[PDB]
Amino acid sequence: ERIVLVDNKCKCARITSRIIRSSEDPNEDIVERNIRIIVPLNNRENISDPTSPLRTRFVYHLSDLCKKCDPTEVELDNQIVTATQSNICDEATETCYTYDRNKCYTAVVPLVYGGETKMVETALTPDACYPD
Amino acid sequence: CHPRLSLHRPALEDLLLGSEANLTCTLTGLRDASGATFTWTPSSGKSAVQGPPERDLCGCYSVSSVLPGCAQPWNHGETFTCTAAHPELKTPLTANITKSGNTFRPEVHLLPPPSEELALNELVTLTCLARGFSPKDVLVRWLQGSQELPREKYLTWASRQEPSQGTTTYAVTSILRVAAEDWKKGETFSCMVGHEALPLAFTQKTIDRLAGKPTHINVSVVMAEADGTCY
Amino acid sequence: CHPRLSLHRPALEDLLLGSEANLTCTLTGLRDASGATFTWTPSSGKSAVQGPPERDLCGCYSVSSVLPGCAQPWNHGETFTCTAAHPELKTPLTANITKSGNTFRPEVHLLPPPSEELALNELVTLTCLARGFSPKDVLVRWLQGSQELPREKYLTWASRQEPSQGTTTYAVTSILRVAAEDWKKGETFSCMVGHEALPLAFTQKTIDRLAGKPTHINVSVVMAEADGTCY
Amino acid sequence: LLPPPSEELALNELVTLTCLARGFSPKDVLVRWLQGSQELPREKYLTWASRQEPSQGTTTYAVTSILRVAAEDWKKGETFSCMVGHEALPLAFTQKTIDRLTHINVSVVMAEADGTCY
Ligand SMILES: *[C@@H]1O[C@H](CO)[C@@H](O[C@@H]2O[C@H](CO)[C@@H](O[C@@H]3O[C@H](CO)[C@@H](O)[C@H](O)[C@@H]3O)[C@H](O)[C@H]2NC(C)=O)[C@H](O)[C@H]1NC(C)=O
Ligand SMILES: *[C@@H]1O[C@H](CO)[C@@H](O)[C@H](O)[C@H]1NC(C)=O
Ligand SMILES: *[C@@H]1O[C@H](CO)[C@@H](O)[C@H](O)[C@H]1NC(C)=O
């Protein structure tokens, strides 16, 4: 529990790791890997309202949790080159399991006002859709 | 014997790390090293200086030239039209070159060291494998921490084509041997690969001892009736 | 034209499996026609075949022949003298070929697939690697269970030398791509390596799943009414 | 006595069982095989002759024998033994160390904690 490898929020998973080294018998140590999953028991499959029942199957692949794609800088000889860090994040299309506390989610519903119908917008997480 | 005309592409290294894409144009199979004239159809910086009539089959004549000009037109798909008019033939002949289409981008993988090589505490091996790319040109560099290692500390093989799953693709490999003290201490090592089909022209993979096979795994699954917001 | 230095030893791909060892030694330098002179100082019942010439640097020719003497004189230490003669200058640099000494063994590792390719259900890839052997001759074959795969399913690079500390050594790799259903069934695969400094001329390594499995697993399920998540 | 290899439990055709006897001074020895409760004929297994075992100090011997049974019945859980006789043993007795076939621990904690993370 010391160094954070990933803290992902679309799937809400967190993975840390730590080397704890014995001094006697220097040929064998132990390397620890901790995983924490939080399962939402009341979310839908797609995130809109009328979609489908409760999501009842939750699938986590380690190679898609730890995936890192925002570019980086490498200095080769005397040059700064921009490199990518992953093979697989072609643009979204990822299915998220939870909401994210700093992004806000809306829906569109038709209602009537005597004559014709409008295109009323509706907040789904009200703490984060405040316009300011 | 026989005189022919051949045309080589620019090298990968000065196209990516630099931009100076000097070209070349080679005919071989003559024996009179004074008469040669070359001609390109686009020539604005036209001063293409010819090279030395160097050695050949037991000291015969073989001459080439170089057209300077950097890498903006080559990426957009221009064409170049070197022709020769030497006096040992009765014909001017021509070939051409173009940045090729039908390309695929490689898949890079770093492999952690073997377990049996770590039990001896001398030196450990890292392997870099890049695969599935359509031209025959690639680069491989290595880094320690954020410091690039010098080129004489690692061995890189050549680029060859792999068995056919329909269309032709290629492969390459590379190894690097480091001390078994700073692997276990926790330094980081990177393998970088450069190729023409990748969008930013470079891609990187980094590994260290924490990002490998662990010995212990702790799994904790928490069911939450409260909310689905993931604080 | 000018005489040079050339060497040709018996083939390892027929020396470890069969007993069809053929010696063929070289000494070239082409100015005159057939003025043929030999050195086969053991000639104990062998008849040297000669044939037609083939293509060279626009006019020149070169000659050689074959002795089938596989009665174990080569891995004993006979010196098998090679020395030309002609109506020309009697000053050769000579060739004297034998089984060489100061030999080292290879050390072979077989690597598991990367976990990115597993979670896609396509072909997966394996890697063989051998390094540290003193002459640069080696054979690499693959197996599936007990069946030797045909040698057009896999790619093998050449044999190159390493950066080192005094003593010189060599290395070689190869790959084999199999289907993910065969991996996830439980079928095994193997890499075989042949070399002449090994006492039994072959080594094997084998891989499947359940090879680098971890030995400790903790699973805790936290129910409702007990959430205690920290930020 | 030894449990079967893993690779015989893959195609599930037949299953072989090895009986090893090691290190005695007088070089006359018998081996008898049995499944369940009844003993077997001498023509239903293969047994070797005894040769002097290489060892430091004094000279002793060794012998081996194998027998191949089906796969599904060893998945069922039948029982074997290997009755090796001798001269210098007070009853000339057997060894029946055989099973049909992982360390597991399961706990439930009510966990009255004052305050922790998860
Ligand atoms: C999950 O549910 C949401 C909500 O229905 C899906 O998003 C929306 O899906 C609709 C249905 O095709 C798309 O409709 C389009 O709406 C525009 C108006 O903005 C209209 O002019 C078009 O003619 C079309 O009907 C819409 O693009 C889409 N996205 C929004 C509103 O942002 C979503 O696709 C669902 N995801 C999955 C994987 O099912
Ligand atoms: C370019 O090459 C192609 C095929 O090699 C052929 O049309 C011709 O040799 C060249 N054409 C032009 C327009 O340069
Ligand atoms: C074989 O020829 C080489 C050529 O220089 C020479 O150095 C070597 O001594 C020769 N071998 C013998 C046994 O004379």
Curated annotation (Swiss-Prot), chain A:
Molecular function terms, GO-annotated: antigen binding; IgA binding; immunoglobulin receptor binding; protein homodimerization activity; protein-macromolecule adaptor activity
A GO cellular component annotation in the UniProt record: blood microparticle
This protein's record includes keyword Ribosomal protein: no
Domain of life, per lineage: Eukaryota
Keyword Protease on entry: no
Alphabetical GO biological process terms: adaptive immune response; antibacterial humoral response; glomerular filtration; humoral immune response; immune response; innate immune response; positive regulation of respiratory burst; protein-containing complex assembly
Disulfide-linked positions: 10-96, 69-89, 104-129
Locations listed in the record: Secreted
Keywords: Disulfide bond, Glycoprotein, Pyrrolidone carboxylic acid, Secreted, Signal
Record: glycosylation sites: 46
Described purpose of this protein according to its UniProt entry: Serves to link two monomer units of either IgM or IgA. In the case of IgM, the J chain-joined dimer is a nucleating unit for the IgM pentamer, and in the case of IgA it induces dimers and/or larger polymers. It also helps to bind these immunoglobulins to secretory component.
Subunit structure: Part of the secretory IgA (sIgA) complex that consists of two, four or five IgA monomers, and two additional non-Ig polypeptides, namely the JCHAIN and the secretory component (the proteolytic product of PIGR). Part of the secretory IgM (sIgM) complex that consists of five IgM monomers, and two additional non-Ig polypeptides, namely the JCHAIN and the secretory component (the proteolytic product of PIGR). JCHAIN-containing IgM interacts (via CH4 domain) with FCRM (via Ig-like domain).
Protein name per its UniProtKB record: Immunoglobulin J chain
Annotated source species: Homo sapiens (Human)
Full-length numbering of the shown residues: 26 to 159 of 159
Curated annotation (Swiss-Prot), chains B, C:
GO CC terms, sorted: blood microparticle; extracellular exosome; extracellular region; extracellular space; IgA immunoglobulin complex; immunoglobulin complex, circulating; monomeric IgA immunoglobulin complex; plasma membrane
Subcellular location field: Cell membrane
Keyword flag Transmembrane: yes
Intrachain disulfide bonds: 1-58, 25-82, 128-191
Domain Ig-like: 3-98, 106-208
Signal sequence region: none
Membrane topology: Single-pass type I membrane protein
Source species, domain of life: Eukaryota
Gene Ontology MF terms in the entry: antigen binding
Keywords: Adaptive immunity, Cell membrane, Disulfide bond, Glycoprotein, Immunity, Immunoglobulin, Immunoglobulin domain, Membrane, Repeat, Secreted, Transmembrane, Transmembrane helix
Described function: Constant region of immunoglobulin heavy chains. Immunoglobulins, also known as antibodies, are membrane-bound or secreted glycoproteins produced by B lymphocytes. In the recognition phase of humoral immunity, the membrane-bound immunoglobulins serve as receptors which, upon binding of a specific antigen, trigger the clonal expansion and differentiation of B lymphocytes into immunoglobulins-secreting plasma cells. Secreted immunoglobulins mediate the effector phase of humoral immunity, which results in the elimination of bound antigens.
Subunit structure: Immunoglobulins are composed of two identical heavy chains and two identical light chains; disulfide-linked. Monomeric or polymeric. Part of the secretory IgA (sIgA) complex that consists of two, four or five IgA monomers, and two additional non-Ig polypeptides, namely the JCHAIN and the secretory component (the proteolytic product of PIGR).
Protein name, UniProt field: Immunoglobulin heavy constant alpha 2
Origin organism lineage: Eukaryota, Metazoa, Chordata, Craniata, Vertebrata
